[PDB]
Design a binder for these strands. Structure first.
Length: 246
RNA sequence: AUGGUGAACUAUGCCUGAAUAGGGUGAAGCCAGAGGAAACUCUGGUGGAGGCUCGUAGCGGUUCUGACGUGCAAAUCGAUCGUCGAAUUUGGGUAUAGGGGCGAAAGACUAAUCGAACCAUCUAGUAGCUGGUUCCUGCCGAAGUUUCCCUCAGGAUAGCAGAAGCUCGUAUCAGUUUUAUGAGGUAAAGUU
RNA sequence: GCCCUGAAAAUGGAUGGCGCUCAAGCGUGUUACCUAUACUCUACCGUCAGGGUUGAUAUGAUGCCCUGACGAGUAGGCAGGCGUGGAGGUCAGUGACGAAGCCUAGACCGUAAGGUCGGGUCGAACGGCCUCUAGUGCAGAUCUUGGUGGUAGUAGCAAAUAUUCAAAUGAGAACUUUGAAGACUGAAGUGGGGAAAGGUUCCACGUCAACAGCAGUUGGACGUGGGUUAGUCGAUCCUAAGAGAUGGGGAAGCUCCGUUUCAAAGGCCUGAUUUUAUGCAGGCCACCAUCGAAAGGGAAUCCGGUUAAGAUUCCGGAACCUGGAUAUGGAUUCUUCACGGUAACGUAACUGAAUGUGGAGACGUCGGCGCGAGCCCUGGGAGGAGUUAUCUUUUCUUCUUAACAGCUUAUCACCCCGGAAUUGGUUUAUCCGGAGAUGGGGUCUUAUGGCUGGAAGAGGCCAGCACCUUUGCUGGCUCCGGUGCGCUUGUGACGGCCCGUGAAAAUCCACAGGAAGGAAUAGUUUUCAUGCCAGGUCGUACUGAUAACCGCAGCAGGUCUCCAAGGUGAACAGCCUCUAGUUGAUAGAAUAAUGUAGAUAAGGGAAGUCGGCAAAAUAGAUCCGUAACUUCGGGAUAAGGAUUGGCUCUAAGGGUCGGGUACGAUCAACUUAGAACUGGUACGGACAAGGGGAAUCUGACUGUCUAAUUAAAACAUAGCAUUGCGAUGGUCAGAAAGUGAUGUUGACGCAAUGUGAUUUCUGCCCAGUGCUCUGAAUGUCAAAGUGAAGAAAUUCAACCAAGCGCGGGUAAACGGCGGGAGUAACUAUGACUCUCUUAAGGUAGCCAAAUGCCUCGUCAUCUAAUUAGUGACGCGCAUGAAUGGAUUAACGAGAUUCCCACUGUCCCUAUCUACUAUCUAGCGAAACCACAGCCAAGGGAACGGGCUUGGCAGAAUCAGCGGGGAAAGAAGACCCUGUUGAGCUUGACUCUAGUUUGACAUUGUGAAGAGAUCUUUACUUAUUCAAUGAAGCGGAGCUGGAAUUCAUUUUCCACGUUCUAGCAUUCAAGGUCCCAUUCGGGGCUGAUCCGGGUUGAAGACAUUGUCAGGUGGGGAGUUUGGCUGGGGCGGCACAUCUGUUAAACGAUAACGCAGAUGUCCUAAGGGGGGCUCAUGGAGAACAGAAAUCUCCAGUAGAACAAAAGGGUAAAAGCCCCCUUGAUUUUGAUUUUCAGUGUGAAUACAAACCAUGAAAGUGUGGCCUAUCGAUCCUUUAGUCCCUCGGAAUUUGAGGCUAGAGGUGCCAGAAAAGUUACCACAGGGAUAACUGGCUUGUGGCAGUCAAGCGUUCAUAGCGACAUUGCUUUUUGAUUCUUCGAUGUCGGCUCUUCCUAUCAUACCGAAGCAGAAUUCGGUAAGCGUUGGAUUGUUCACCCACUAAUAGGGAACGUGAGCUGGGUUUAGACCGUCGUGAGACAGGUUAGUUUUACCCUACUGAUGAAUGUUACCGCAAUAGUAAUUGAACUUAGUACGAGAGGAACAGUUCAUUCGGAUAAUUGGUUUUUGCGGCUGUCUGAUCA
C-alpha cells in the first residue's frame, strides 16, 4: 500500500510551523533569587498581536539584577492589562491581575493562567485565549496544590510553581462563524499545512484505510484500538463511547 | 533483486519580489428634513463594503463532437465559452526522492515515462508458449494409441521405426484354408 | 413405366459449355474404337541378394565380371559424396610472358551438390591430391547492418490582408540596393530596452560549393578580421526561507543527528614604559564558524559629444562618496570645554571612554481626496516646410534646460497668549475641544515646488559665404502665457478590511552617563571652511524571439518585466491615423467538381435530429415599467414597452475681483434638460454589443481536479458532531542516537475521523463485529525461578504477568430495522393482544424519484397523435433518517421537459466571395508492396485476382470517385489457456517493524506490613529529567516580634522596594585604620559567619540491553486443484463394484442409462449334525382379513448383513453342538497392468491347531467392491547390531513385522479480487459474419370430423399426416484473436415474389352498388408525423396503396455516435472488505487514398495524307396514378340507393430541357445613401 496522510506529517517537511511573523516564544521569567525571595517589578511596554496565536502578547521590561541593563520578556497578556502597568513578579508580590505569584501564595478560589507544571518551566497550562485554572485547594505539607485544568481535569502540582493572575485575553474568539473557506485559509497559512482535509472516505484503497468500494462508506468500525500500530490508526482512536450526547 | 541519478516539467508549504481597463449594484458608518408620547419608523442626501456582478490584459479549455489528423504543432488553429481582486496569477531562491515524495482525491502528479519513475549491474533472468534453423543424392520409413503424473498446449512408459550387428541355415513359422475338437447366447425363432 | 402438376428467393447463369428431339434424352443388348507413370518385352541408371575370378611378365582386390529381383514417401534415421576458412605432408605444382577476384542467352564433364575451359576487365598472390581441424554452406526469423527501388516528377510547398514601376549591380533579379508609389503593425506594436538562456549570432570586407524545403549578386551561411574601457552601474558585503562545519553523540561502514548545541570555544581598550618597546596592569564585552538574493537591505554621476561595431565606462566639462594623512583661516578657552529665544527651538563651529538605551534600515491591501513631475490639449510671437482652380489671419514642425550646490516655500506635528453655552471648528468621507477648541502670533521637517549658480559657452532651428580635398567660416533667433473629474507614475494626509495585523540583518546616527584629558604668555578642535593623496578584482558586445532561448528545425507552440501619442467611445475594447518598424510567408495563368473559411435567401417556421447541434434573433445609452417566490440580502438588465441623426437656438450649473467703520467686470470649463426646423422613417447608421419565460432532477454558494478522450451530480468548503490528549503526554518519524516534526505549542490548543450552508428534524436496536472499562475470578499461560523423582542428561508437578475468557457502557462506532397470529355492526380496512427468532421490528418523511425488476406501472393533464414531461397513487424486486431524511431563495459551460422570439435544421435547393484543387517553372517526400490487378458460376479452410467451365479481351492515358483489394494503421484491450505476473482487500497460508507484559542484567543502603512472596517507604551516590551567560543553596546566627511564658524560652514567622510609563552602570560613597604623604595606593566594614553539593524534581523505580509470551494487512513473501460440448455452478464419469450401452471368445467410448461403495460381523468366521422355505388348500375354545396347533400339495415363487447379477435343497438356507484357520513363516500364480505398485483373490509347501465317528473341511465373510507410498512418530519381535581411544548403566540409532494418512484415493502444506490492468499464446476455445442442421419460429399442400338458413368443398378446418422457409430462436465450433471497425438511423442503387395498390381475368349464397377468394403478373408505385437509441410496435392524418424480404443481419477510408462497452461519478441490492451487478444514471479523441481495379466523365498513336456527309451492329430506354364534368340520377331496383365503355378538363409521383415572365442570388463594388477615421477643407 501507500503511506497515508497522517503518517506523512512526522517527517515534517511541508508540515512544519509557519514561524516568520511570530514575536517570539511567550514564557515567564527565569526563576531567580529576587523572584523567589521577594518581588521584582517590570512595566508592560506594549501589548501586541502575535501571528499564529489567538491571544495577544505583552512585553514587560524588567531590570537585570546583576548587570546594568534592561531585559524585556514576552508574556501572554491577561485580560485587563494595559500599557503603563506595573507588573510585579515574585513570592511576596500581591494578588492583582497580571502579577505572577507562586501558587502556594494565593487562596483557594483564585483564577490564574499560564500556570507552570513544574517550577521553572516558564509556563505550560492554560495559555490559550479565555482560559484559566482555578485554585481549589492546598496541601501545605509535602507541598502541593489542587487546581482545575481548563478542560475540567483536576491536577495536583507543586506549590513553588508560578502562575499569573487572571483570564487570558482573546475570549469570545470562536463565537463568530467563520463563514467562508477563505477565512479558514488565512487562518492556517500562519499555523501549518493541515488544510483543507480530504475525507479518507473519498480516496483510494492506497490512500487510506477508509478508501475504495463502489459506495462511500467505511466498511469496518471507525473506532480503533489504542494498541493499534503505525498507519492503522485513522478514525476515532480508542474511544470509550461514541455518538451524540444526551 | 541491488547500487546509484533527478522538483529546469508538474505536485504542495515556506522566503522575497511583481502583475490586474472601464462599467453595474450601492452594505455598515454619517448629514438635513418629515411623523409621533415613546421605542422608533418613513423621505432626500453622503459614503463606497462584497471569496457581488458585466467585461478587456491575464489564467483556463465548455460546445462545434469545427479545422488539422503521414499536421505548424507527439496536443496546435478558429469561432464559442468559464473566471477575471481574490482559496488570484507568476519569476527567482528553497524544502520534500522511488514501495518514497506530493495530492481542494483523478490512482492524479513526480522532466513526452506513473496501478510503483529514471540509469547500470545481477542478466545471455525463466518460458511446458510463438517464429526461425543454411549443400546434394542413395537405401529404409512412422505416429496421433496403452499405463502413470496438480496429468489435459507437457513429460515418463510400452508400441510403431532406424542403425549396429550375432548364432545359424533346412527351417520353424503364417492377418490363409481343410479335417478334428471346445467355448459363445447377438440375428432370426418363440427354452432353441 | 415415361412426362406433367405438387415445385416459390433474392448480382447474370450454368447436364462443364455449345447445343441435342426415329437424340447428342431415358431402359436394354451386341460390337468397334480411344488412353495412366498399372500390365508385358527391350535398353540404361542405382539398390539388394547369389555366385565367378589372386599366377607371373602392368596400370585398380574399396577391383573386375556373372545372374536375378526390386525402385512412392512427410516427421525420422543411416550410407556416400560436393563446397568453405586454417594445419601437416607431397606435386623440386601455377604466376607480372599476368595469381586471386569479378562480368560472360560462349564450350565441356557430372543424376546432382558442383567442377573444367574460352573471351573481356584486372593486378600479386595461388592451387591439385593423401590427411588434420572448425566461428564451415541460407530464401524467410514483423531477423542485424548497409544500399536501393516501385509509389512519383506524385501528395503537397494555400493561416498571419499586398504588392507594383523604374533605375543601379551582375553572366544571370518576382526575391539584392536606392528612389517612386500602395499598404500594414497602431503604440497591451510587427516599436525603444533588459532578466533567464545562447555565445560572437554584433561589425567590416571579401566569397556563393553547401544552407536558407522557390531563387539569390542578399544572409543569423562561408573564409578573414576587428570589437565589450567604471571609485559611483551590478556582483563583491548583509541577512531571509534553508544549507552546513566545529565540540560532541550514533553507525560493521559509505556517513547520519544537530548549529550553540552537556565545550577550558576569544581579542579588545588603553593605563602602567620613557632601560624598549609592550611587560605587567584594573576593567571589560560573551553576540561564540561559514554559506545562502545580479528582483529584497545597500556609501557615492550627471549633461553634451564621440564609433564600421563600445559608453551613466571613452572625451570635454560640472559634481559626489569613501579610506587615509596632515596644514591654513575661523571658532572656543581667564566663568577652562559656545551663545541666543518665555517656549516650540535657533546656529558655520561649539570636548566625551567603558556602558546603556532610543531612532533609521523597516515593510499588507483597497478606496476616494490633495499636491507634484513627464505626457496631452492649447492662445500671442519669432523662424523653416506642405497646399492654393476657389476658400483658409491656414495645416505640419523647431523654441530645450542634467547630476550637484546655495537661498526661500507646505500638509501634518508643536509652542506662546487667551479661556469657550447663545456650543463652536470642521473633512469628498463627522471627527475635534477645560486633558484648553476657534482666535492672534511663532517653531519645524523640505518628498516637492520657486529664484540664482551649473549654463549657454551646450543642444536645437534658420539664414548667409567660400569648395576635388580638408571643408569650415559668418551672423541671427533660441521668447511670453492659459487649462483640466484628462492620462501615466511618485507622494502625503485620512478611511476600510481581518479568528489574516502583513521579513531579518549588516550598517549608520543620536541620546544618557562622566572615564579621562586639557586655558594665562598661552592650550585645543579634522561632526565649521578650505587645501592634499589613493579609490583594486570579475561583468559590460548582440538577440530577448512569426529564423539568435526550448521544442530533433529558420516549428502558427512555450517564455518574467518597464515606457506608451491623436480621434471615436464608458474605456489600456474595436476601427482608423502621427513617431519608429517592416512589406518577410514560392510564384504565374485560368475560375471544373468536392472541399475549407465568410455571406444571402421566396413561402413555411424544428415538420429536420438522440437532442434547436449549428446559425439567426437580442444587444449601447435615456425615460417609463417590473411577477411568483425569498434565508428580506435578492430575484432584476426580470418580463416587457417608448426615444436616439442634423442644424439652429433657449436654460441651468463655477472663478478671480474693488466696496467709507445692494450691483459691475473679466476669465474658463464638459454636463444635463428643453424647444423649433430638417430628411426616401433614417439616426448605438460601420464597429462594438444579454435572447427571454413556466417548471423538474441535482450540488447551497466562490473555489478545485484526470497536462494530451471525462470539469461533473465527483474533491473542497463554511456549518454540525464525535473521538484521543494536562507534557513522565496525544498523533508521527528514525537503521541508530546525548534523535526529530506538531512546538516560538497548552484544551477558545494539537492530532484522528465522519457529515456537508440555512430552515426543520435526526426514530428503534448493544445479540453479532469493534472499541472501551474506577470491574471482577482462581479457568488457561511462555521464559526464568520453584518442588519432587533419578547417578546424570532429564521427566513431571504446581505457581505466574499481560492478553483473551467473565460482567458493564457504547450507534452523529461498523451496522440492522423480519416471521408467524389474533381483533372495530354487508365485504373489507385493522388502533390492540399475544411470541419465534443469540438485538430490535422501518418511526417521521419521501417515491416508478439519478434508487421500482415486473414495466412502455395505473389515473389525470399536456398534444391531431407522447415508451418523453409533470401532478397524484404506493405491501417500496431492493426508499428512509450525520450510510444523513425532508424542504429550500441565490448560484451553475451540470442532466431534462415545455412555451415565446428567431431562423436554410428542414420542405428543397440555388446562388455568391477568398484559398485550394486543376495547368505551368523550380523544388519534391511518405504510408504500403508475396506476385499481381476484368467478371459470372462452381468446388475449396464452408465469401478467389489466379484454379475448372464459360463470358470475353486492342497501345498510351487525364481528372473525379469512394464498390472492392475479407485496403493500411497495432504479435486483440474482450473470452479462454499457462502449474506467467502485478495492483489492491481479508477473520487466506507463512512471517515482520512497532507496541504492551514477564524474567535476567544495569542495581547499591534498609526499614513496615501482610502472604509459607508481595504491598507500602525511607536513603543517595549510580541512572533519569529540567533550568540558567552553573548568583545568593544548606547550617548557625543577631534584631525585633506573632507568640504564651508553668523557668526561660518551648516554636514558627519574619527581617530595606506598591498612588505615578522618572532614575539606578566606573574596586561604592560614607565610616575607620594602615603606608611614609606626594598624588594617591593598600585594608576593614558598608553588604553577619561556616561548608566550596551550581539550583530544582525523580530515584535502585523509570531508562538501557538480552530472552519470553501476547498483539500486529501498518508491511512483506506466497498461494488461491482437475476433467468439462466455452468458462462459472452442479456433478464425480478423479479410487472402486453390478446390470446395461456391447454388435454370441477377450477387448471397447460419451457429464450414456439403473443403482451401489468409505461400512457390517466373535459370528453373519470354521467344522459337524438334524431338518425344510415362499405360498395355497383342508381342520381346532375364545380367534376375527392374519396369533397358536395338525395333515396334504409345494423346483425354491423363501432366505442367504448391504447394490445388482450369478450360486445354493438330506444346502451355501433354518435350528442346534463344539471351537478360533480372522493363526505362524514366507515364496509361486491370476486379475486390473508397464505383465510395475497398491487392493482382492487362487493353489500348494513347512509348522501348529478347530471340528467330525470318519473321508475330509477351514489361511475371515457362498462369489463379484468395501481401500493407501517415501519422510516423520510409535509397537511388537531377536533380546540381536552400533555409538568408531577401552569399558558399565541410561539415552539414541539400526535390522524384521505392524499401526497413525495422504477421498485430488501412484499420495503439494494454500483465500479473494481487478471496471486501472500486464505478458506469452490460442480460432486446440467463447462473444461477433459466414458455413451446415431445423428443434422452434414463419410460411404451402393433402383426408374432411365440423362452423356456415339448409349446403364438406361460397367460405374452412380440428384430429393428424406430407413438405417448403435462413427476415425466428437455437445447436454445433468448420474459417478468423501477428483484429473482416460492433446497434440503429441518414443517403443511395439493385435483385427476389410469398401481390398491399394499379392492369386484365376467373368465382360467390355477385340485382346494382360493395366486398370477398382465386388466376397470370414484380412493369410501376408504396408516404408526413407525436412518444422511444430503438430495430419492432402502437397511435394521429393523408393516400390508389401506405406489401414482405435479400445483397458479409447491403451500406462508418459514406455520415452520425443516440445505444451497448473501458478509465471519472451517483444510487439501489449484495459482499467483513477490495469489489460484483437478470440493474438505473450522467460525462466521455470516430485516423488514412496520391496506389490497382470498378464506376463516372475527358483525350488519344496506328489504320497513304486530309476534310465533310453518313450508316447502325451492339448497349441502355419511362413515364405514372388519381379525381372532376359528361354518359346519367340512365342501366339493375318495390325502394333505399346506384354503375360502366367512349369522350372531355385538370391533377399526383417521375423525367428532359429551358430562362420570355416571377423569384432567389450580387465583386457590374454598377449607381445612390450612412458611419468612424486619414489625405488642410470644398471636390474626389
Amino acid at each position: 500500500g501507500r503511506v497515508i496522510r497522517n503518517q506523512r506529517k512526522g517527517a515534517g517537511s511541508i508540515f512544519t510551523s509557519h514561524t516568520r511573523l511570530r514575536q517570539g516564544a511567550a514564557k515567564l521569567r527565569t526563576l531567580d533569587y529576587a523572584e523567589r525571595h521577594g518581588y521584582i517589578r517590570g512595566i508592560v511596554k506594549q501589548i501586541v498581536h502575535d501571528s499564529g496565536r489567538g491571544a495577544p502578547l505583552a512585553k514587560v521590561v524588567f531590570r537585570d539584577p546583576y548587570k546594568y541593563r534592561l531585559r524585556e520578556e514576552i508574556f501572554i497578556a491577561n485580560e485587563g492589562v494595559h500599557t503603563g502597568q506595573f507588573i510585579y513578579a515574585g513570592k511576596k508580590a500581591s494578588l492583582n491581575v497580571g502579577n505572577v505569584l507562586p501558587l502556594g501564595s494565593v487562596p483557594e478560589g483564585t483564577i490564574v493562567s499560564n500556570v507552570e507544571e513544574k517550577p521553572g518551566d516558564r509556563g505550560a497550562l492554560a495559555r490559550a485565549s479565555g482560559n484559566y485554572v482555578i485554585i481549589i485547594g492546598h496541601n501545605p505539607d509535602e507541598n502541593k496544590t489542587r487546581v482545575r485544568l481548563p478542560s475540567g481535569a483536576k491536577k495536583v502540582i507543586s506549590s513553588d510553581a508560578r502562575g499569573v493572575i487572571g483570564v487570558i485575553a482573546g475570549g469570545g474568539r470562536v463565537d463568530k462563524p467563520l463563514l467562508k473557506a477563505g477565512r479558514a485559509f488565512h487562518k492556517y497559512r500562519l499555523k501549518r499545512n493541515s488544510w483543507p482535509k480530504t475525507r479518507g472516505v473519498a480516496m483510494n484503497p492506497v490512500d487510506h484505510p477508509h478508501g475504495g468500494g463502489n459506495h462511500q462508506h467505511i466498511g469496518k468500525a471507525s473506532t480503533i484500538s489504542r494498541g493499534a500500530v503505525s498507519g492503522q490508526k485513522a478514525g476515532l482512536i480508542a474511544a470509550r463511547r461514541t455518538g451524540l450526547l444526551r
